[PDB]
């Protein structure tokens, strides 16, 4: 009974000096080769086990959810300050969000996505194929669900509350560290930066949390039981500052979601741009299945592989959360022959598996093959875990895969794509690149 | 015996909301008025107890300082994967460097020297506009380099330039507000220093180097004469790698950097105020003359001008935070409990603005640090190196580099800019900027 | 959410200034008649919580099991000292121990029982209805079983092996305390003496220790499979697949079957003070057993009556009126209060064995308690005289076993006299020293 | 490199509970050095406990290291979730004054250290008169021991004696002393082990006591009394320095501070107990003592403190004789406070430890002859006393013995003032005194008969 071999660290630094000059990933991967699916690498003085590979990475957050659920000291709360209780709410809370977005797939996504598509179809109609950059289309969109499933109806694209929200939750901003800067963080065991908050886009911080306050505000006078129209009032359901708050704070996660499947389409698109001939294989399943006189629905996807097997492809190379998402063991556990005491922080490197060669024939190319059979049909492929598994498994996966599937394929029954570049020059190294791309009505 | 007061917290933001639009400086200043100079703020889940005014953060790093002296999680070992004996030899390791820096304090004359390259380079300009950013991490990481590998770079030296860069090297990484409300969510930030990538070829090649120094240093090195803080190294080697080294180096360096924006900020400073840069002036000329260069003992006899570094120090306040600590045992502190393991950040800034110690926080004044018969004054209230078991290693030496580089510099030229004194804006790190030097 | 509330501690002493006159369970008594069935007490400066009562007991053992198995400091193994994986082989070991005692239940258990019950009446008839002390004959009886169960063959009552460790494991010794070194103690935060410290603990062992060997040595010598005999060469399976554990596992065992042999004792003594009662079970014997077979296990469901009272025997005596304290092993909450990780808790069985809301008359012996009103056995919930949930006894089968067919097959074949009258008998946990007197019933 | 001190592999549940000699567990600790040095881990049950041997060894921990070494077991730990911190506090303060107040007893101004030695005078008065009284009967001197060293701590507390006799005095004798065991097999030992916990635990037995209520009464009946008559700045005993402190919980706070000063006496009493048989297996020495007494104290006048300066041999005799008695072989248990570097091996916070007191007290570096009676252990050439660094008794370091001063004031004038007007005998010749314990490091029961010298 040992702990996960790993490369012999340095004071203050751990094992900084030892990664590839190619970035982090690549030396997990080299240090697969020598030390194997689960190993220990150092930063800082701190431990963490690295955990490579589907197998390795299934059996721990699957086969041992409860053990390896643990989120990270920043998240934990400490009695002896905040007392128990709080611990327990918090518990209480999780559950009920986890029960709530069941609920939501149990005018449900697949209505209010179908709904949502056909606006961007006209807003790209209104384009008249003008070159452009989706990244501010697929935000309004993939957000706008959001919307819908938090205050009851889309906003308008262009309507101010939504832009000034938009800017909240995605506002980039950056932080500027030194090398030097950084080595002496490590030396202090505290970093220079932290969380909170927004400078200037905190400028609608102040008018987003009042916007809920409005909504609330209307929603409780209009409010209904058993008919909870939307998340609010299923909010003032459970009730019946702090309660503007913690809505936003759902609101918050839920948009760092959204982000990540606006993402995934910007990237989809633009692989799409760089393969055409399968654009146009898409384009002909649609049409083959869903004709040219109905929106797609969400039951189509059942009688369409192609399409499925290629948006899998997508999730597969974008490798939006290379890393998954780091947690902390609960309870000392036993893993693949090695000992995980409890507390120990965890990485199930997502892309591992994503990239695992025991599962996809060719990792690292775009290969829809990876998800068909001989006959052509989906084929469950164990490495696809872009959503991480197990008890923490990403509360979206069923309202962010339904984006996915429709926005995609109603796109492409209604325009087809061309860009400036020309295919072969498209580079998919990256986040995805900013770039340029025009809808063309068909 | 309770917990130091504070705001009431919200799940996985803590009291986050509750910051002034102004930033979290200010925030901590409107909490001192409503709670006091000991209280409880939260970020994320964690609670941390954040120390103001000079009276409180002495108490603390000073009158307790060991049990105020603990370092953040990061820099914990833990012995279940590293055992204990790692966690010693650091403990050893490090009061070896504490021992070093004390038989340091030499650097006079090698800041004096670099010193004077400094104003033959400062003649090369021919009074021409520049950005002294460059000029002032030079001459300070020399300092460094003198003190580390016995002697300093030629300004232009390639190599020097490549570690310039490492160390220097800025690069930033990318948050959105919702990316970040969901790292407080996990428990887990997005980026952890050093992680990055990376100037791995720099490093590398420094790495490497540091290989060649040590390898040249060991041929020819002997006592009772160590040259330089490589040997000291391979001595206590020999007494009982690469890597090591590297690591004392980039603190220094850490270190140094703070020193040259300390003379960035203090110049520009010095550009809206000229008629103090002229009273230095007179003063350099009445105590060190017109032929000699500026020397340590000079200072004792230059109170204006002691007092005038000392303010630019005040008012610079490069880092206004302090460095968090960590308790060390559970303690009783002004009258609250404070729980082993308890982070707590002891605000500089709050000491070196702290009314209760300087007439006027907030604009630039030397009277601060001056009797009525205008000698140099203790004022209990400065304290931008920290105070206690952890207080600045390399106090000596800035403080060195602040007196010289600075009066040197003042004694040989004049400074002129573009903006006229009124218009110099000195609210933010210094911005960029330009200046000139006229030789006298 | 808050703490169990209690009464206030004292420097040092904590609660032990508080308690009754009367004993520690009377206190624990008056007690929760003012705070209620979960309170906190102080032993010295460490708390304690007490649990009270069978709804209590029952939803902490059962309802939260795994947050309330945690065992003592003393059993806990230190990683920093031992490491992980002894944690784990332990636990391991643990589940196979778990495994084989249930196995023993599924030549077999019941017989093994059966055949040394004849062995006691033989005894019992050669006593010529002498007047004894049956002390000895009970803790011998019991014993056999284990042994019969771990070496493969009951020893005869005078075999000098047998008696060498019936010796060994029933062996009293006692250590002596004042009041002064007492409170002492408390401020050291350390007792004067450790299980396991005397002398004497050692040298009865090591010579307990070299039969074992031999018996591994022949049993080794012998044996095929699954032609295993005993719990000796599944040792030697799992091994194959030392003397040191079988010892300690035995040594339990013996632990568990001195509480059984008391359970007889006091079993015993009782009837002789209700003689009437005695009466009946000999009818009921008679009426299902008639007068010329063994009693056997398979009879018990058809004697209520008997069993009832068996089951007011164990409920009466109630020899682990504290349980065996636990120690909870998650931050929990319960019953509207927390309970942090780590805290130490009494589930006081006697406090749910003497539980009104369970027994007509908690104090008198009454196999009514037992009985629905057409007289067959009733479930009672009060009755947990073996604890319940994941620690459960673990000789529960084996125990009760012993207890029906060693309580039947004598009063089958004899009937029981004493000096005393029932009227004078003393029920004043220890069961009084006696003299009793076995006629057979010929 | 930094490593934990070696020791014994051990077992599941057990630990090393295996492989203790048949002798007893310090014979244990004895072999377990040999093979492993001066400082190693043995484990009772799961847990490990880092085991001192020798002078040197156990006076860096608790000498060098003290503030390490000074940490109290878990028993004595309060828990800040349950009771908060500031009771730790208190209790912290609380001890200070405690240890404090042991001083003010001691030295040496104002009442100190003369009124203690006048009081020990008197009641070692009434021992010799009670002695008298004995007209030379054969006794056991238990209770007899047992009652003069109380009456000190009595004298101390309440401020002044009882008489021998009276009611209130054998009551708390009673309650202080009042033996009483619990009873365990070999199984439900290795039972507890497995549990995590002990069946038994202090004060959870419901004997102790009856008087426990009555006594408590009693210094009600005192601080009463005391209350109403007591004046500063001259505070006669403990109960109203008590009553000081309060007026700038009541009985009970007095109740423990008693008990533990009563815990301690009992070691006195047994220390004069074993030192009296000692002397009758060794009459030769026992004239000695009354020689020096003679040439010192003379025939006139009670012994008084200053003269165990002028007295070497009594002295070293007395310092033997606490030496070989060795009443606490195991010391107390410490706890470590900070991960600690000790002796090239590393201790974690929090770790058990035992100073094994005997293990000093018998050590070969500093005894010429370990286990033989012999006063020349603490006399050099010349016959004056010499320090001897293995003469630790009383322990040393942060926590040692509070009563250190008290207790051996007892013993020099306890012992000279009896072999000053009497001398001693008993049935049993000298060459038969057996002075090996009993099953316990307690002396062996016996008779003895004082004799006035007139
Ligand atoms: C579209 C592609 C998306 C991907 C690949 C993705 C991926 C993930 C991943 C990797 C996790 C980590 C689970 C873990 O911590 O083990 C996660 C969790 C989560 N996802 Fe998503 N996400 C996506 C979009 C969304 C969306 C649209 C939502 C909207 C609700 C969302 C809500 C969440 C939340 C709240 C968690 C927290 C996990 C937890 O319960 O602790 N994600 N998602
Ligand atoms: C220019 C003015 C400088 C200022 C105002 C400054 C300020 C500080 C402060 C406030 C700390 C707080 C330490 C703590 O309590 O955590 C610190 C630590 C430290 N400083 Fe500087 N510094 C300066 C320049 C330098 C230089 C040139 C060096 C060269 C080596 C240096 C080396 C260090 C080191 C090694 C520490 C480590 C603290 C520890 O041992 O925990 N500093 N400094
Ligand atoms: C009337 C007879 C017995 C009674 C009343 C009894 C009662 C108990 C009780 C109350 C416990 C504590 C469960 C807990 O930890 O909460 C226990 C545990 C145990 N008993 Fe018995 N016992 C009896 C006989 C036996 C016998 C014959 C054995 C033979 C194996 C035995 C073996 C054990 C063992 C090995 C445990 C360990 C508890 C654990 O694994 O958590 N006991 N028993
Ligand atoms: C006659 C021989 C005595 C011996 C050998 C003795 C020995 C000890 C020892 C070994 C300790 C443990 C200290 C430690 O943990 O290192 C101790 C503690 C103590 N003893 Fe004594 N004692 C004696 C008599 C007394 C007397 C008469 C008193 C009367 C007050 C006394 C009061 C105490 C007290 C109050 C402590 C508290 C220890 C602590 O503060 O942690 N002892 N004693
Ligand atoms: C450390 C902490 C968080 C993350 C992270 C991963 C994915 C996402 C986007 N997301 C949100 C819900 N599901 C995916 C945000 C943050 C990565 C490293
Ligand atoms: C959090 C992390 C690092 C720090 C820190 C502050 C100052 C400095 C500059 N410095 C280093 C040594 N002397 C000055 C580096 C890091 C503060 C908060
Ligand atoms: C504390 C420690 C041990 C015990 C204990 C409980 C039961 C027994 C007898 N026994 C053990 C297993 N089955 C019955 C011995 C000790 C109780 C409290
Ligand atoms: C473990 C726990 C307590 C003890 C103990 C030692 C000495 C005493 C008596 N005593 C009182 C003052 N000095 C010693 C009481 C208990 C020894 C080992």
């Known amino acids: 009974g040992k702990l996960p071999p790993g490369p012999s660290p340095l004071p203050v630094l751990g094992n900084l000096?030892?990664?590839?000059?190619?970035?982090?990933?690549?030396?997990?991967?080299?240090?697969?080769?020598?030390?194997?699916?689960?190993?220990?690498?150092?930063?800082?003085?701190?431990?963490?086990?690295?955990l490579c590979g589907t197998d390795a990475i299934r059996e721990?957050?699957?086969?041992?959810?409860?053990?390896?659920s643990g989120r990270g000291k920043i998240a934990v709360v400490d009695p002896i300050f905040?007392?128990?209780?709080?611990?327990?709410?918090?518990?209480?809370?999780?559950?009920?969000?986890?029960?709530?977005?069941l609920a939501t797939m149990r005018r449900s996504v697949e209505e209010r996505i179908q709904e949502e598509a056909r606006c961007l179809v006209e807003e790209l109609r209104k384009s008249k194929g003008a070159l452009l950059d989706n990244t501010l289309l697929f935000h309004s969109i993939t957000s706008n669900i959001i919307c819908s499933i938090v205050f009851g109806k889309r906003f308008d694209y262009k309507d101010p509350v939504f832009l000034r929200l938009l800017d909240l939750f995605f506002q980039s901003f950056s932080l500027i560290s030194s090398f030097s800067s950084q080595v002496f963080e490590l030396f202090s065991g505290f970093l220079k930066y932290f969380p909170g908050t927004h400078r200037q886009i905190y400028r609608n911080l102040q008018e987003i949390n009042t916007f809920i306050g409005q909504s609330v505000e209307?929603?409780?006078?209009?409010?209904?039981?058993?008919?909870?129209?939307?998340?609010?009032?299923?909010?003032?359901?459970?009730?019946?500052?702090?309660?503007?708050?913690?809505?936003?704070?759902?609101?918050s996660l839920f948009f760092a979601g959204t982000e990540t499947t606006s993402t995934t389409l910007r990237y989809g698109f633009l692989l799409m741009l760089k393969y055409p001939h399968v654009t146009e294989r898409v384009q002909?399943?649609?049409?083959?299945?869903?004709?040219?006189?109905?929106?797609?629905?969400?039951?189509?996807?059942?009688?369409?592989?192609?399409t499925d097997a290629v948006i899998h492809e997508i999730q597969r190379?974008?490798?939006?959360?290379?890393?998954?998402?780091?947690?902390?063991?609960?309870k000392d556990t036993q893993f693949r022959g090695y000992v995980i005491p409890k507390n120990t922080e965890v990485f199930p490197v997502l892309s591992s598996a994503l990239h695992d060669p025991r599962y996809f024939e060719t990792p690292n190319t775009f290969n829809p093959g990876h998800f068909l059979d001989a006959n052509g049909a989906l084929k469950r492929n164990e490495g696809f875990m872009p959503f991480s598994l197990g008890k923490r498994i990403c509360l979206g996966e069923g309202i962010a895969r339904t984006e996915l599937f429709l926005f995609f394929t109603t796109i492409l029954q209604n325009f087809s794509i061309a860009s400036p570049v020309p295919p072969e020059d498209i580079d998919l190294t990256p986040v995805p690149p900013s770039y340029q791309i025009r809808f063309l009505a068909r």
Not at 24 to 31: E, K, T
Not at 236 to 249: A, D, P, S, V, W
């Open 218 to 251: 209307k929603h409780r006078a209009t409010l209904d039981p058993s008919n909870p129209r939307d998340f609010i009032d299923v909010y003032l359901l459970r009730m019946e500052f702090h309660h503007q708050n913690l809505i936003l704070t759902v609101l």
């Open 82 to 101: 905040q007392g128990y209780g709080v611990i327990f709410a918090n518990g209480e809370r999780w559950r009920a969000l986890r029960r709530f977005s």
């Open 317 to 330: 190379l974008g490798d939006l959360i290379p890393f998954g998402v780091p947690h902390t063991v609960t």
């Open 284 to 306: 002909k399943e649609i049409e083959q299945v869903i004709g040219s006189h109905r929106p797609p629905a969400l039951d189509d996807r059942a009688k369409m592989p192609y």
């Open 17 to 50: 000096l030892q990664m590839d000059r190619k970035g982090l990933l690549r030396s997990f991967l080299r240090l697969r080769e020598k030390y194997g699916d689960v190993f220990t690498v150092y930063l800082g003085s701190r431990p963490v086990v690295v």
């Open 60 to 68: 721990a957050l699957v086969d041992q959810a409860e053990a390896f």
